[PDB]
Structure formats: structure tokens, C-alpha cells
Amino acid sequence: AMEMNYARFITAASAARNPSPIGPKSMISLAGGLPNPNMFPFKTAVITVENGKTIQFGEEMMKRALQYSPSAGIPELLSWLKQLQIKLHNPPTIHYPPSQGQMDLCVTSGSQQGLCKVFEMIINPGDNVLLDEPAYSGTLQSLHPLGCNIINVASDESGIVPDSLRDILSRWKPEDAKNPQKNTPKFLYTVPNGNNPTGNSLTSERKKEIYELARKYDFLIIEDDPYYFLQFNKFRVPTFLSMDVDGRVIRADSFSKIISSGLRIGFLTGPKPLIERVILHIQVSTLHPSTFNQLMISQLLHEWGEEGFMAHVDRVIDFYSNQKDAILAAADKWLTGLAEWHVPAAGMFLWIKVKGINDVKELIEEKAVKMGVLMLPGNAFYVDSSAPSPYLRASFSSASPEQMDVAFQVLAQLIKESL
């Protein structure tokens, strides 16, 4: 375990944040001075749940659900998720001292809130960041105003190529990480399972190689992993968090694809000194994630248990895997000869390279639309969105087999008559 200097990953503004000058701690007991919840108009709730179950908010629970709650999340959700992270990832940092990157969790208002806060905590203008393009548009949109240089790491069907990362890092010496003025990268960001838009996932062996490069040049890994629970291989690949001997990994998990996107509940797992910075920023922004929505999820998860949760996840994977089977069969049918793709390892996107056409934006935004078919041009997933893209992101989250037949029959036509 290498010693971490967390202060180098914390901006002046982030470091300046202080805890508020304001038995077992609960808002039920400690909210006497906060707004009186008897004034709130919602009184009880029943929410039906799959397999003929319910969640009930009685009068007391409704008052809690409608009241303020801690910035890091409700304690019982944090506690249940801590145990989930232990079971799934057994992170090395569980019992490290706080100052050495003890594993710490924060519930966030979506995972993207967590990620944004992490990026803001770290990045000064002119810092270098590593990621693999095509990358999620939200991440690129988030990094742009922070004024970092984004250095693109090559990727393939197995995600980031370690040799590319190695080749990028050879630009510095390892000892340059001790010299702020050398500007060695502050972090590597990646989506390690079912990258949006590619559908590609890292292997265990590559993750080990990337982790060791992160030690060698002393940078953080931001493991943005919203499709962790949507891997089609039922043996889930070990995560960067699971290898994190140094406490250099910040992991973002999301409920958005398995439980609800609209509830805006995700969570960060990472070293305590960095997670604390994020919590303090949350505390002066959203204050906390919706108490009501946390209680819906926390109650569901407590009633399910870890087995029930994982069973749910399995049923979600089964649905998306059948959808993947269907979209790959339409691709096989119509696009063989006219386009390239890999089988998605996780998530909900098929990434289609159109052969013999430099850009596909006109092909969609005039020709495909007019034929009642829309897919997404690839340009949005690069730092330079004006550069030509031969790629299309096709979602298999919703469309029927019949709809995928039509869309791809229509795409095949337009590819033929555009060559």
C-alpha cells in the first residue's frame, strides 16, 4: 500500500470548505428546530412493488420522508450499501485509518452529482485528465468548463488498451508526479462496464494493468460504473474498487438503470478524505438527496435483502440480454457487409460503425428521420463534436424485435444508397 497525498487532488476551494459551525443521531429526534412536518400536506403512502408486494409509509415515516436528512444520505441506506460494497467488492480500504483512505460512502442525487462534485474537487484549469473517447457526453460537458486538457486513451472491444495508457504516460517520468509543475495526470476516468456509447467493458487483467499504471504515475481512478449491475456475463468482472490497495479509486454506482432514474439516487464509494470534500460541497448545494426517495429505496432493499436485490438485478439483466440478442439478430440480418460492431458486454447500447462513409449525421438528421427511423450520431461522444463520425449508437432498451427489423432494414437501405 503506497502512501497517498490526497491534498494534491483537492483544489484550493474544495480544501477551504469547513464543517458547519452548527446518543445515536437521528432526525426523528434532532429536527425540533427544523420546519414542523405536521404542516406538510402528504400524510401516508402505499407504493406497490413487483411480485405483489408493497412499501408503506405510515404517519411517522411520512413525516421523516418529508423532512430534512443528512448530507451523506440516510444512515440505514449508507449502512446497507456499505455491506453491499463489502460483499461485491471487498475493498482493501475498509479498515484503513481515515487519513489513509478508509472506504467511505456518500449517497448522491444521482451518480452524476457525485461525479461532478469529484471533478470540481480535483480539477484546476490546465490539469491533465485521461479518459477513453467515445465517452459519455455528460462527462465531457462536465469537464469542459473546468478547463482541463482531456488526453484520449485508446480503447477497443475490451475497453481501455493499457499499452496506449502506458504510451501516453511515457510522456512523463513516474517521479514527475511529485512535481506539480510537470502537470502529470490527476486522474483516469472510465466507464468499465458497458461504456455509453460503445457497450464495451474492461477485462480483469487490463484493470490490474491500468491500476498499476495509476500507482506508478500516482493518479486517481474514477470508476464511473452505472452498468455494473447490467453485465451479460453472470460472472461480474472485478472492479477497480476491489483492487484498490492504495485508496486511489473513487467509484460511482447508480440505481438509474435497475431501480429508478427519476428518483435521483446514486452513490460514491471512495477514500474518506476525498468523500468528505464531496459531502461538504453537497451540504451547501442540494443539502441532501430526497429523503422520501431514499426511504423508498432503503425500505425496498431492507425487505428484499441482498439476495432479493441481486435476484431483481438478474431479472433486469435477463430482459436486457434478450433485447441485446434481438438487436444483434437485426444487425446480422440487415447490416452484415455494410457495418461493423462488437457484441455489447453490458448495458443497453449497440455501437455501429458504418463502412465507407466518413460522417453519418446527415444520414440520420435528414435521410433516416424522413423514413421514420432515428438513431444517434456518434459526434456527441468526443471532445471535438465537429469532427466526422462514422458511428451510430442504437439503444436496445425498449424497441420490439419488429421495430428493430424496420429501423435496420431502413438503415441498410440508406448505407447502400450513400456509398
Ligand X SMILES: CC(C)[C@@H](Cc1nnc(NS(=O)(=O)c2cc(F)cc(F)c2)s1)c1cccc(F)c1
> Does the footprint of a second copy cover residue 85 (CB under 8 A)?
no
Q: How far apart are CA 319 and CA 325, in angstroms?
A: 10
List interacting residues with ligand X (CB under 6 A).
20, 22, 25-27, 30, 32-35, 68-71, 75, 84, 87-88, 137-138, 196, 229, 231, 234-236, 283, 287-288, 306-307, 310, 313-314, 317, 374
Among a second copy, ligand X, none, partner that 324 touches (CB below 5 to 8 angstroms by kind): none
> Does the footprint of a second copy cover residue 272 (CB under 8 A)?
no
Q: How far apart are CA 148 and CA 125, in angstroms?
A: 5
Contact window for a second copy (CB under 8 A) among 2-10, 148-156, 231-239, 370-378: 370-378
Q: How far apart are CA 113 and CA 105, in angstroms?
A: 14
Report cis status (omega within 30 of 0) of the bond before 197.
yes
For residue 338, give the C-alpha cell.
455494410
Q: Which of 6, 66, 77, 72 is nearest to 31 (CA)?
A: 66
Contact call for residues 365 and 377 (beta carbons, < 8 A): yes
Among a second copy, ligand X, none, partner that 65 touches (CB below 5 to 8 angstroms by kind): a second copy
Rank residues 186 and 264 by Cβ distance to ligand X and give the closer one: 264
Give the count of beta carbons closer than 10 Å to the beta carbon of residue 107.
29
Give the count of beta carbons closer than 10 Å to the beta carbon of residue 8.
15
- Residue from 107, 331, 394, 414 touching a second copy (CB under 8 A): that is 394
- Is 136 labelled a binding residue? yes
Q: How far apart are CA 46 and CA 6, in angstroms?
A: 45
> Does the footprint of a second copy cover residue 205 (CB under 8 A)?
no
Cα 276 vs. chain centroid, distance in angstroms?
A: 19
Rank residues 93 and 139 by Cβ distance to a second copy and give the closer one: 139
**Single-letter code of the amino acid located at 157:** E
- SS3 assignment, position 270: strand
> Does the footprint of a second copy cover residue 6 (CB under 8 A)?
no
- Is 391 labelled a binding residue? no
In the region spanning residues 155 to 194, those forming contacts with a second copy, defined by CB under 8 A, are none
- Is 183 labelled a binding residue? no
Minimum Å distance from CB 248 to a second copy? 24
Give the count of beta carbons closer than 10 Å to the beta carbon of residue 83.
11
- Give the residue closest to ligand X by C-beta: 33
Question: If binding means CB under 8 A, how many residues of this protein chain bind a second copy?
Answer: 107
- Residue from 200, 239, 291, 298 touching a second copy (CB under 8 A): that is 291
At what angle are helices 111-122 and 272-283 packed, to 10 degrees?
110
Rank residues 8 and 82 by Cβ distance to ligand X and give the closer one: 82
Residues making up the annotated binding site are 68, 136, 196, 393
